Amino acid sequence: AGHMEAVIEKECSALGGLFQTIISDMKGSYPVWEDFINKAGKLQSQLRTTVVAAAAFLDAFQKVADMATNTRGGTREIGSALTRMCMRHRSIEAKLRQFSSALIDCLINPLQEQMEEWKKVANQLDKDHAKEYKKARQEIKKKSSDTLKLQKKAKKVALQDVNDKYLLLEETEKQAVRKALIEERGRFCTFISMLRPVIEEEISMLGEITHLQTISEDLKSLTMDPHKLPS
Amino acid sequence: AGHMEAVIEKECSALGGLFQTIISDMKGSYPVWEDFINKAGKLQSQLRTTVVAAAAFLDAFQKVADMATNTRGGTREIGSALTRMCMRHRSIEAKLRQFSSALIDCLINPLQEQMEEWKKVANQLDKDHAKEYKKARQEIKKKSSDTLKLQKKAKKVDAQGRGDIQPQLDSALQDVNDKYLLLEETEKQAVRKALIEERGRFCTFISMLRPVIEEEISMLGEITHLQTISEDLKSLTMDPHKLPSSSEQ
């Protein structure tokens, strides 16, 4: 570590420092992504259990509907309407299953796999940059040297080559930063492509709720004046 | 007790039978109702656990959004859009909690308390009917008894109990028929009450179920917002292999 090496390193690293910020950010990100995969996993397992409970509940709901259908007068119409309501909830259950499936198959498992690949890709970006950077450096530590001795034996009575290699390093670093910015953004794009089908299933599941209102109104109509006999 | 009475008798028997059927059907209904309560309880318990797991997931999702938000260029916009997605999901989570609460407050617990009161009311309707039926038969027995008195004292046609006793005997027989009709009316009203109670049980159930379904229906308002945010996310993640104009500074 000399004075000439400090000056040179002060020049170079000023160029390639945004790179290290992006890289450091990516390398520090994994615990956040890991906790996400963990909590998503725990939600999906809980949704699977809820689906099983929902299906058993709907079996019992249907038995209640059947019981009304097997009474006599106006109670038979109540039963048919309860049956409709049960069928509508079964459709909602089937979409919840598809939502739960997309959550594990489209998001959790793929994000988990993508994780080790992200770590390897960031390691390599960092490694390759380090290489290009420090050979670029040592080659300009070497050209400033040649210029030093050439300037101290000419005053007893190459400079452009140093300048070349600095503009050279400027565009190297520019390209490395472009590459890191694409990888950084790309991780989120990838994550969002995985998220998309999960949210589509959620929208499809919610959309099945539109059929409940008509049935609830019918049930309301069929249960007016419970103190007297209908027609 | 002649032809007309025997006809009424069989209607009373049909009605009496129908009343006992309705009472028996009500009495045998409880295992189905109890199974429904049990399974609604089991679902509500899992929904409670789901809502906690959903909130923890959303906390993690928001940390991911924060991470993107605090990077550079277009990735910051992606973070902002992800935050909009996460906040909209907090609204869905809230509605899920409301549905879970309504399921227990409006349906499971009320239905559970209702069981014993349904049993008491059905049993009382049965006992009231038996009491009224007994009285009606007694009335028929008493008038058929007098018509036996009259009819035995009418066989003595030697005191001209024919222009005087026969009008009496005609009315005595009429009164008997009156009592049979009264029994029939008692049976018809018993059936009516039993039918009303049978239907009323399902009316009660529906009244408990409807506010639960209302909380579910309230989730329709969320859909348009998920659609818009998902279109924004798609637009923000175009050409992942390339730098967006937003990242070129």
Curated annotation (Swiss-Prot), chain A:
List, for all copies, the residue spans of the domain called IMD.
Answer: 4-231
What tissue specificity is annotated for this entry?
Strongly expressed in the developing neurons and skeletal and cardiac muscles in embryos. Strongly expressed also in liver, outer layers of the kidney, and in the Purkinje cells of the brain.
- The chain's coiled-coil residues are 111-157
- Where found? Cytoplasm, Cytoskeleton
Superkingdom of source: Eukaryota
Q: What does this protein do?
A: Inhibits the nucleation of actin filaments in vitro.
The record comments on the domains as follows: The WH2 motif at the C-terminus binds to actin monomers.
Subunit and partners? Binds to actin.
What family is this?
Belongs to the MTSS family.
Instruction: Indicate what this protein is called per its UniProt record.
Output: Protein MTSS 1
The primary gene name is Mtss1
Say which residues of the entire protein are included here. 1 to 242 of 759
